[PDB]
Enzyme design. Structure first.
Site: not given
Ligand SMILES: [Cl-]
Lengths: 250, 244, 243, 195, 111, 241, 231, 235, 240
Positions: C30-31
């Site tokens: 995920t970012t």
């Protein structure tokens, strides 16, 4: 983590060869030529100083090394391997001899200790053999002058004269024609320079050649006076100027 | 991990043989021949140096024949460096025994311990075995004169006459032909040299390509003497038997 | 070939393929981002809501080291926790011997050397995380990003994960439009916007926003989580910008 | 423990060892055999610290028996005595040393000679025609200096030994409850039952 | 020189009936001629209907009780919640005490 | 062919892992250069900061090992920093044990010995870096000593490292053929830095701004790096001549 | 394929196959369900037998008076991990006189599992765990995966056909979360949840295993005739 | 090659699964639990007629209240039995009581997965552990090299296991007497054994609360064999 | 330390290293054990490709472990020395602590346990040796004969053989050995042992070794002439 390589990396092949030792000897063959000649009153060891770049200062890189005041060493093969062997060889002369007997080891026994170190790199876990052949020249009171060759396997042989490395085959043949049992030290230096010129291609002078002798004691190189029994090192490295003097009457 | 690069030096083949031991024996079969002959009044050790160069220093040299103590010696066939590791161990073991019991070590006891060390390298540790075969020649007051041999497997056996290294098959047949039990040392000296001369891979057998030794009771009264032959002495013994 | 089967082996290029393979695990994650500001740093991360059954606000991903450093990472979450546990040990021994809390550049090299050590042997695996971290020390604010190889640099803004390119582009605009500097409270709002914009590259599952910050004036130089009114204010700012 | 004696004569070694085991103000046993057979022609007597004595004796016994089985051969008395000395010489610089004094009587079959060795807890070895450990020596050495001859028979040695026990029973403070006597010769080890 | 032991005073008493048992102890805790506490309990319910008191040096007493209480907890975990009988507790406490034979708990224990 | 995966010999007596570590050296695509003056030793290296989000002040391949010794690295930064931390620790220990500052050549030998071990021991990989150590030694004077993954090391009159190293090397060779001496015959370090940048410009054929370069200078009793403005001041001086 | 020989090797797409194969062992395991309200937390587990002559493999383990878990996969690995949790809970009590937070319990399990995924010679744990507990911040439910990933949830399920119960709980979320101060109803919801994962078999008296912990309830397990109430 | 502790793609440990194949090659062992006791029986299977069959020891005492039967690489069981005996006696020393049968089994099963790169490989032997304690009464456990143990009312292990287990499924009920169980083990052993069953190539044993663990004499088993043959002919 | 698991299971449930160690035993010289009514006899083959041997000093095939127990073997000679040494040490250790020599069963159980340990220990290979262990328990006149093998299993035998062509001599013993009436005397037991080896050996010259063990530490090795008399007698009865 931790060294998980607790097993031998050198093993016997079906034909009986020890692969890594053979390949180490191949690395020595690629190496620059070095030689040694034994005279009646001394020993000479010599090699070419192959410069990596003209900007490099080849004086800072010493191929001929003092091990004890009466013993010197030269090599053919991998330089880094040689450098660490000289460190270990200098230390073992103290730890396993001088600190026990209060005197330096005879040539044959120091050679024996270096040979042991090289043999262990052939059998111990997680290491390759050393990629060098050594020529060790020295003097001691009860054996006189001597010259030894040490190979990657750990084997060592005494020589009257020999060569190792690039053009060793031709250089050995040259030495057979010239060597006799009456050679004086100056005659041996002369033959050493002649033999080396055959294998050297480029410049041939005191800056591209490295040469040392085991001969008479040098009281001027001792650094002190007052003890009669201490007379100075028999090992001496010939200067760049001293080599050029002998290259004129060549 | 490192499993990838492990040769597994201490395993069995499907046939029940130890790969590394077999390959070490193959290595030893290319080494210079060494012969031991046991007579009633002494033992002879004879060995051929590996293809010599004329600039080799012959007198201050030792390659084949080594002294373990005053009563025991060995002839080597294989890697010299490997042999010296084992020789130093054997020398120390002999001194440990002398220090403990105030008596010189019996020959078999020394041979067994050295052979047990070799055995260990074939069963555990993952290291290559020692590529060496010994001929042990020695004397003690229990069995008198004794010849033994040990090989990389750590197996040892006793002999009246034996060869190791190159051309053992041909050498053993020749020894089996001319050996007899009432033989003397001087006869055994001749048999040893004659056998090497016929089995050699060289053109002709000369003094500079040989090492020689005897273990006699030829000292003065009830004591044993080790004689490692000098170059000139080998030259003389080679002429005395008419080989050169 | 076979050069990629073992860690610490050089390929004929001079590359360690196992580290490059660990980078692929980071790109899959995920970012997460980091924004350096006037007198501190701001961290934010995307938390994918896999199911309704996840308890909101109760799977915290940003981690504190000592009392002044914040750490966030993308990739294998357990690997990141291992790195922070080491970081906490490193920071504790520094403070034990030298009294002062560990400086951020000093802390950065401690993690760097440790991660680099996991590229030296075949008996260990490289870290499957890129870690964005930083805080405030005696010399002011510092932001860092550390990769599986052990490589790290100082950053004005940093981003990693599946939406790294989207986030990087948005970060570069802030650096260009604000040469004098960005304030702490502004950086929190911008962090929310960038996570929402970077969520376009992971838009199947909807997400939960998590922010933290260190600031000399706003948090007194200590790491704190952004919660309640300040969080909702930042969420609303982000919601207004996507539409 | 307390009294252990040894006499080497022409053809044998004779060991005499007291039978008493005392602890505090109580003689706990009056028939204790303070000896171990190390090999068929080697016997070791012992005295010293309680527990240590038997533990050491049996440890040496086990080692010599192990050697015998391994080599199918009997170690010489000289070889056994050297092994025992070295073990005690190690022991004296240990964390807790063996406080045990020993006499080793053996018949060397290769030399056809009896041999007596005296070894103390420090590892001090001497070969002797006659030996004693503890306070016994202060009476017996002078007595044997006078009456001992090197060419005596086993019977003459036993009478010489009776003279020592009588002197000890007269002048020693403690009741040591007599001695067990054992003879080591060419035919091995045997015990004299009526002494 | 540092003395690792102290004396915290107090006294304890145990009596057994036909279908019951009592374990009593005073609540005073002291060092030398000073009172540390007028109410510091040293008789404890350890579970499985076992009461215990280790009187003497309170630090060793508390340590022992703490270790035995923990021993009861792990006895349940390892043996399917089986009740620790008083005789089995007694034997277990012997090993707790003798484990420090060469640096003893300075207490007189009653269960 | 597992002889190409660990540091054991190939049939032709080569160590492929060592050779591949040499190729990792150029992975950063940066060229470095070192020269000696009368009183000083100057080292310069290219500084490439591609990402706009990077803090340019933290991007460096020059390290201050001790007060007197500086080191520039050619190779990936993780291995570079690994080498730097060890060199710093080694130099500190030397001073504590032997009572004087570790010489540049001795540190070079020590780091070269460590590198040699990785070529012989299997469990340790070589570091994919080339280390150039610089100082003004109190005995030997201005000094340049360089280490590689093979464990080789030697002193230099001057040197260069990187992808376009050969162009820089010959450029320097041709100057020392002309000048007939072992060094830059100049009083101030400022002009030796100017010489270094000038000859790098000629060899590479590129112009440099203040942020395209990185400069380290060694004088008696201290080694220091230059700021962007110190380099800019130096670039202006070259342009006005 | 070539990258699944050990845990220390990444695949070209950045996967750890040994960890994924360990994850597969959980999928073969018998179903177990976890769910909570604000006052209580409940575990429900379907036990599995070898045949009609054998006993039913116990799925639920107690860690402390306020904490415990259920298992799916390699049972010996659950025994190792539960034992570690028992020790950590115990260390917290003896040293700090403090009941171990269910969240810290999760963090500790994560880090223990992780170390087995980065070193040569070892292997990942081959079991999944559902941890329930009641601490100073109320009721909790955690899901442990041997990759190291620990997740706090209102409800969940792991094992074969766990997707049925997981969907049901996702629908029932708003109902069961507000079952406060009523143990029997929260269990009923969990028993109805695990029923969505059954095929050809139904819940019998020596098949069903239930555990509960809460505000005024120590962690206790129900087996045999004590679960007949809920069939 | 490959790691010893490696998982297969189906989520099983290769070495544990391979050791299970070794156990299938082993000689048959059967156990039946009743309310009057637990019976343990094994096939001896002598490889040659010159081998003295009474030296074949595949049923073994752990304590007075616990017995054990084995199948597979039986040499591997020696250290497992040694551990079991020590665990049983040690617990009696620490707690002045008999150790529960389940606790004993769990202790033996803790050794199982202690292999890798601890011992070099899993055990190649399965154990049937039978005993009695005051809490759970008469119990029979099947201990595998996976570290897993199931309680059984009846269980067969070894080469004839799947056929014998199907037979035990039909025959077992909760009211079996000890004598009925003895005959049932003999009956099922005779079915799956290669050579003809007699007192020399099969061995019986039991554990009861009153008399503890007892291995039967060859004379006692011979009469039960004769009683079994007569009853099968009687209808 | 070298850790590699060399002995491991294969897909079919075999430990190949243990099974390949059995092949080494099959290669070894034949060894046979036969127990009578009041004795046990150990017979051993010695291969005759080795002439010029010194039989005084060459290691004997039958080794004394204690004064009352003996051990013979088939397989790797070097491996057997390690087992014999360990057995001899345990024999003395048992006498020291129990104050009684080992039983033959106990000594066998120990040797077998050592062999088993080398099948699931890291960094080691199994022993390429099977042993025959024979003797008499202290103060007992019942003969004992046991066999061990690389896997670690052991068992008691009325008569047994190991080594090369052992299946041939086992065949012989299976029809010639009566359980109801074992060789009543020493002569009968030695003869049956020599007969069994003559099925496999070659010449009855310096190829057969015989060692007789009787109760109360009565062990003696037969000489060439003594054995040759059995060989001569058996051949004359055969021509019929
Ligand atoms: Cl160094």
């Amino acid at each position: 983590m931790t060294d998980r390589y607790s097993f031998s990396l050198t093993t016997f092949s079906p034909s009986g060869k020890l692969g890594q030792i053979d390949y180490a000897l191949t690395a020595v063959k690629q190496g620059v030529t070095s030689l040694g000649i034994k005279a009646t009153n001394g020993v000479v060891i010599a090699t070419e100083k192959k410069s990596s770049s003209p900007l490099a200062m080849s004086e800072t890189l010493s191929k001929v090394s003092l091990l004890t005041p009466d013993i010197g060493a030269v090599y053919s093969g991998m330089g880094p391997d040689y450098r660490v062997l000289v460190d270990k060889s200098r230390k073992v002369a103290h730890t396993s001899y001088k600190r026990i007997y209060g005197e330096y080891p005879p040539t044959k026994l120091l050679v024996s200790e270096v040979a042991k170190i090289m043999q262990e790199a052939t059998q111990s876990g997680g290491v390759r053999p050393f990629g060098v052949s050594l020529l060790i020249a020295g003097h001691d009171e009860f054996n006189g002058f001597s010259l030894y060759q040490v190979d990657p396997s750990g084997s060592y042989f005494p020589w009257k004269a020999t060569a190792i490395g690039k053009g060793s085959v031709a250089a050995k043949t040259f030495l057979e024609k010239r060597w006799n049992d009456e050679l004086e030290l100056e005659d041996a230096i002369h033959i050493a320079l002649l033999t080396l010129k055959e294998s050297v291609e480029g410049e041939f002078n005191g800056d591209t050649i490295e040469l040392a002798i085991i001969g008479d004691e040098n009281p001027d190189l001792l650094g002190y006076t007052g003890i009669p029994t201490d007379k100075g090192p028999r090992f001496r490295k010939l200067t760049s100027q001293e080599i050029n003097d002998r290259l004129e009457a060549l | 991990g490192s499993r990838r690069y492990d040769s597994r030096t201490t395993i069995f083949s499907p046939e029940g043989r130890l790969y590394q031991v077999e390959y070490a024996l193959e290595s030893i079969s290319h080494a210079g021949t060494a012969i031991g002959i046991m007579a009633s009044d002494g033992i002879v050790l004879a060995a051929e140096r590996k293809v010599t160069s004329t600039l080799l220093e012959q007198d201050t040299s030792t390659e084949k024949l080594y002294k373990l103590n005053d009563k025991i010696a060995v002839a080597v066939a294989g890697l010299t460096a490997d042999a010296e590791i084992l020789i130093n161990t054997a020398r120390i073991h002999a001194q440990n025994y002398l220090k403990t019991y105030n008596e010189d070590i019996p020959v078999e006891i020394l041979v067994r311990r050295l052979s047990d060390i070799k055995q260990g390298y074939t069963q555990h540790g993952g290291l290559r075995p020692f590529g060496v075969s010994f001929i042990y020649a020695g004397y003690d007051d229990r069995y008198g004169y004794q010849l033994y041999t040990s090989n990389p497997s750590g197996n040892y056996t006793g002999w009246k006459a034996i060869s190791v290294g190159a051309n053992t098959s041909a050498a053993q047949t020749l020894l089996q032909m001319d050996y007899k039990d009432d033989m003397k040392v001087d006869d055994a000296i001749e048999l040893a040299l004659k056998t090497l001369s016929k089995t050699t891979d060289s053109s002709a057998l000369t003094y500079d390509r040989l090492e020689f030794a005897t273990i006699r009771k030829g000292a003065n009264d009830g004591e044993v003497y080790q004689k490692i032959f000098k170059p000139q002495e080998i030259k003389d013994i080679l002429v005395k038997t008419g080989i050169t | 070939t076979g050069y990629d089967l073992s860690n610490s082996v050089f390929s004929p290029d001079g590359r360690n393929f196992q580290v490059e393979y660990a980078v692929k695990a980071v790109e899959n994650g995920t970012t997460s981002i980091g924004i350096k500001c006037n007198d501190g740093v701001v961290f934010a991360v995307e938390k994918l809501i896999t199911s309704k059954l996840l308890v909101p606000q109760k799977n915290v991903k940003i981690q504190v080291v000592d009392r002044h450093i914040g750490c966030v990472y993308s990739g294998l979450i357990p690997d990141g926790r291992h790195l922070v546990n080491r970081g906490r040990e490193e920071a504790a021994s520094f403070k034990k011997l030298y009294k002062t809390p560990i400086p951020i550049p000093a802390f950065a090299d401690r993690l760097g050397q440790y991660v680099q050590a996991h590229t030296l042997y075949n008996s260990v695996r490289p870290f499957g995380v890129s870690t964005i971290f930083g805080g405030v020390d005696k010399n002011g604010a510092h932001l860092y990003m550390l990769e599986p190889s052990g490589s790290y640099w100082g950053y004005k803004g940093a981003a990693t994960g599946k939406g790294r390119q989207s986030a990087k582009a948005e970060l570069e605009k802030l650096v260009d439009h604000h040469p004098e500097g960005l304030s702490a409270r502004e950086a929190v709002k911008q962090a929310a916007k960038i996570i929402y914009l970077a969520h376009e590259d992971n838009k199947e599952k909807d997400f939960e926003l998590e922010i933290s910050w260190c600031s000399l004036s706003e948090t007194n130089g200590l790491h704190k989580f952004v919660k309640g009114d300040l969080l909702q204010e930042a969420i609303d700012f982000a919601q207004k910008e996507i539409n | 423990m307390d009294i252990i004696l040894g006499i080497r004569v022409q053809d044998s070694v004779i060991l005499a060892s007291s039978k008493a085991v005392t602890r505090g103000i109580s003689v706990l046993k009056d028939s204790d055999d303070k000896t171990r057979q190390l090999s068929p022609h080697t016997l070791m007597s012992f005295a010293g610290e309680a527990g240590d004595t038997v533990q050491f004796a049996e440890y040496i016994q086990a080692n010599i028996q192990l050697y015998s089985i391994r080599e199918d051969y009997e170690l010489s008395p000289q070889a056994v005595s050297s092994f025992v000395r070295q073990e005690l010489a190690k022991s004296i610089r240990s964390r807790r040393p063996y406080q045990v004094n020993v006499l080793i009587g053996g018949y060397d079959k290769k030399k056809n000679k009896p041999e007596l060795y005296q070894i103390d807890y420090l590892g001090t070895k001497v070969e002797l025609p006659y030996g004693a450990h503890g306070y016994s020596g202060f009476y017996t050495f002078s007595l044997l200096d006078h009456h001992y001859r090197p060419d005596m028979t086993t019977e003459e040695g036993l009478d010489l030994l009776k003279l020592c026990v009588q002197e000890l029973e007269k002048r020693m403070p403690m009741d040591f409850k007599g001695v067990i006597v054992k003879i080591v010769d060419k035919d091995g080890i045997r015990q004299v039952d009526d002494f | 020189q540092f003395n690792p032991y102290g004396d915290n005073g107090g006294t304890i008493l145990g009596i057994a009936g036909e279908d019951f048992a009592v374990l009593a102890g005073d609540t005073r805790n002291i060092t030398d001629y000073s009172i540390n506490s007028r109410y510091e309990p040293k008789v404890f319910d350890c579970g499985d209907n076992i009461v215990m008191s280790a009187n003497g040096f309170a630090a060793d007493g508390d340590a022992l009780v703490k270790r035995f209480k923990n021993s009861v907890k792990w006895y349940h975990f390892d043996h399917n919640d089986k009740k620790l009988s008083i005789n089995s507790a007694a034997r277990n406490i012997q090993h707790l005490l003798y484990g420090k034979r060469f640096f003893p708990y300075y207490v007189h224990t009653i269960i | 062919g597992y002889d190409r995966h660990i540091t054991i010999f190939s049939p032709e007596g080569r160590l492929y892992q060592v050779e591949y570590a040499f190729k990792a050296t150029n992975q950063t695509n940066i060229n470095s250069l070192a020269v000696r003056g009368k009183d000083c030793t100057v080292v310069i290296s290219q500084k490439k900061v591609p990402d706009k989000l990077l803090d340019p002040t933290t991007v460096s391949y020059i390290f201050c090992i001790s007060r007197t010794i500086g080191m520039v690295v050619n190779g990936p930064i993780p291995d570079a920093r690994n080498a730097a931390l060890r060199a710093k620790a080694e130099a500190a220990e030397f001073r504590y044990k032997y009572g004087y500052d570790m010489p540049c050549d001795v540190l070079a030998k020590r780091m070269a010995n460590l590198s040699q071990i990785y070529t012989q021991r299997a469990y340790m990989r070589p570091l994919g870096v080339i280390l150039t150590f610089v100082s003004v030694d109190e005995e030997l004077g201005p000094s340049i000593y360089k280490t590689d993954p093979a464990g080789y090391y030697v002193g230099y009159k001057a040197t260069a490292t990187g992808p376009k190293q050969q162009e820089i090397t010959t450029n320097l060779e041709n100057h020392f053929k002309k000048s007939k001496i072992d060094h830059i015959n100049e009083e101030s370090w400022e002009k030796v830095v100017e010489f270094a940048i000038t000859h790098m410009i000629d060899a590479l054929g590129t112009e440099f701004s203040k942020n395209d370069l990185e400069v380290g200078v060694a004088t008696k009793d201290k080694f220091f790096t230059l700021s962007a403005e110190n380099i800019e001041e130096r670039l202006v001086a070259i342009a006005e001549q | 394929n070539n990258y699944d020989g050990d845990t220390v090797t990444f695949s070209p797409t950045g996967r750890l196959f040994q960890v994924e194969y360990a994850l597969e062992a959980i999928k073969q395991g018998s179903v177990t369900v976890g769910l909570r309200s604000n006052t209580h937390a409940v575990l429900v587990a379907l036990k599995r037998n070898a045949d009609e002559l054998s006993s039913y493999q116990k799925k639920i383990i107690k860690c402390d008076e306020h904490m415990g878990l259920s298992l799916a996969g390699l049972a010996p690995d659950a025994r190792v991990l539960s034992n570690y949790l028992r020790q950590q809970c115990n260390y917290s009590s003896l040293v700090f006189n403090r009941k171990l937070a269910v969240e810290r319990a999760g963090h500790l399990l994560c880090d223990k599992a992780q170390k087995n995924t980065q070193s040569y010679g070892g292997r990942p744990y081959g079991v999944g765990l559902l941890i329930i507990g009641y601490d100073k911040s109320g009721a909790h439910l955690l899901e442990f995966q041997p990759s190291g990933n620990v997740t706090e949830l209102y409800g969940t399920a792991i094992g074969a056909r766990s997707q049925g119960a997981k969907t049901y709980l996702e629908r029932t979320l708003d109902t069961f979360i507000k079952i406060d101060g009523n143990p029997d109803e929260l269990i009923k919801a969990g028993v109805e949840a695990i029923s969505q994962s059954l095929r050809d078999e139904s819940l019998t008296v020596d098949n069903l295993s239930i555990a509960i912990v809460g505000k005024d309830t120590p962690f206790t397990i129900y087996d045999g005739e004590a679960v007949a109430k809920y069939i | 090659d490959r790691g010893v502790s490696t998982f297969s793609p189906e989520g099983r440990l290769f070495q544990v699964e391979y050791s299970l194949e070794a156990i299938k090659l082993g000689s048959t062992a059967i156990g039946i639990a009743t309310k009057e006791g637990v019976v343990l029986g094994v096939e001896k299977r002598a490889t040659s007629p010159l081998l003295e069959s009474d030296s074949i020891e595949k049923i073994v005492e752990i304590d007075r209240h616990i017995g054990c039967a084995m199948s597979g690489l039986t040499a591997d069981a020696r250290s497992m039995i040694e551990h079991a005996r020590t665990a049983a006696v040690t617990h009696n020393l620490y707690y002045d009581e008999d150790i529960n049968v389940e606790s004993l089994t769990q202790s033996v099963c803790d050794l199982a997965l202690r292999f890798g790169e601890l011992m070099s490989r899993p055990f190649g032997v399965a154990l049937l552990i039978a005993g009695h304690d005051a809490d759970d009464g008469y119990q029979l456990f099947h201990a595998e090299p996976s570290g897993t143990f199931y309680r059984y009312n009846a269980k067969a292990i070894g080469s004839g296991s799947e056929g014998a287990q199907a037979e035990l499924l039909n025959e077992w009920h909760s009211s079996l007497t000890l004598k009925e169980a003895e005959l049932l083990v003999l009956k099922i052993l005779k079915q799956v054994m290669e050579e003809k069953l007699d007192e020399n190539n099969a061995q019986l044993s039991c554990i009861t609360k009153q008399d503890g663990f007892k291995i039967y004499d060859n004379e006692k088993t011979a009469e039960l064999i004769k009683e079994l043959k007569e009853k099968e002919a009687a209808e | 330390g070298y850790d590699r698991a060399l002995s491991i299971f294969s897909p079919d449930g075999h430990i190949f290293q243990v099974e390949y160690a059995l092949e080494a035993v099959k290669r070894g010289t034949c060894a046979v054990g036969v127990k009578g009514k009041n004795c046990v006899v150990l017979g051993c083959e010695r291969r005759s490709t080795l002439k010029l041997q010194d039989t005084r000093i060459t290691p004997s095939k039958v080794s004394k472990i204690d004064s009352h127990v003996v051990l013979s073997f088939s397989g790797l000679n070097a491996d057997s020395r390690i087992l014999i040494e360990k057995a001899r040490v345990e024999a003395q250790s048992h006498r020291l602590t129990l104050e009684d020599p080992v039983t033959v069963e106990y000594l066998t159980r120990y040797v077998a346990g050592v062999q088993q340990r080398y099948t699931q220990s890291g960094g080691v290979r199994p022993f390429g040796v099977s042993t025959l262990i024979a003797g008499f328990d202290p103060r007992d006149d019942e003969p004992k004969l046991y066999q061990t093998e690389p896997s670690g299993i052991y068992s008691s035998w009325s008569a047994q053989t190991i080594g090369r062509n052992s299946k041939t001599v086992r065949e012989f013993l299976e029809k010639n050995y009566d359980r109801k009436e074992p060789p009543a005397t020493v002569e009968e037991c030695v003869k049956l042992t020599v007969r069994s080896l003559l099925e496999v050996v070659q010449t009855g010259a310096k190829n057969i070794e015989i060692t007789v063990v009787k109760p109360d530490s009565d062990i003696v090795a037969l000489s060439s002439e003594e054995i040759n008399q059995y060989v001569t007698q058996i051949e004359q009865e055969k021509q019929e």
